[PDB]
Design a binder for this molecule. Sequence first.
Ligand SMILES: Cn1cc(C(=O)NCc2ccc(Cl)cc2)cn1
Length: 149
Amino acid sequence: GVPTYGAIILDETLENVLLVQGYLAKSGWGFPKGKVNKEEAPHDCAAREVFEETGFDIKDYICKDDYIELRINDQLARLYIIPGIPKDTKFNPKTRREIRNIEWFSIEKLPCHRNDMTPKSKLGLAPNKFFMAIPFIRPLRDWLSRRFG
Ligand SMILES: Cn1cc(C(=O)NCc2ccc(Cl)cc2)cn1
């Protein structure tokens, strides 16, 4: 599958992360990201997708080696880590037919897995509106502990 690139934006306290909420198949909350165009460099794709979904330009803030990358069902997703963005920043998507809402979430309150259905003796996982964000949460928490303390 085509690689995706975007960002994990944190505030100045490093407590909170910025998630966006799409529509339909993308109806839950997730980090801003999208598919790379032909010949486009990973940092440029990240900035483009982030600016389209949030109105915030990360290009002056990206650090090349500061990202979390996950391969999920043989598609690679790389989110550049962008700390220190003020919580009073005004975010507005360009793509308002694609983005319902944009919010800060407490990192410590976000799930890092979905819940099973063992109460009901049924296989699988319960729905969770943070499905797309979840795979990045534990790697983010570990990354912040190493790089800040
Ligand atoms: C299958 N699926 C994907 C998501 C997701 O990515 N959500 C955040 C988001 C990112 C970018 C845009 Cl444009 C819209 C929403 C949710 N469920």
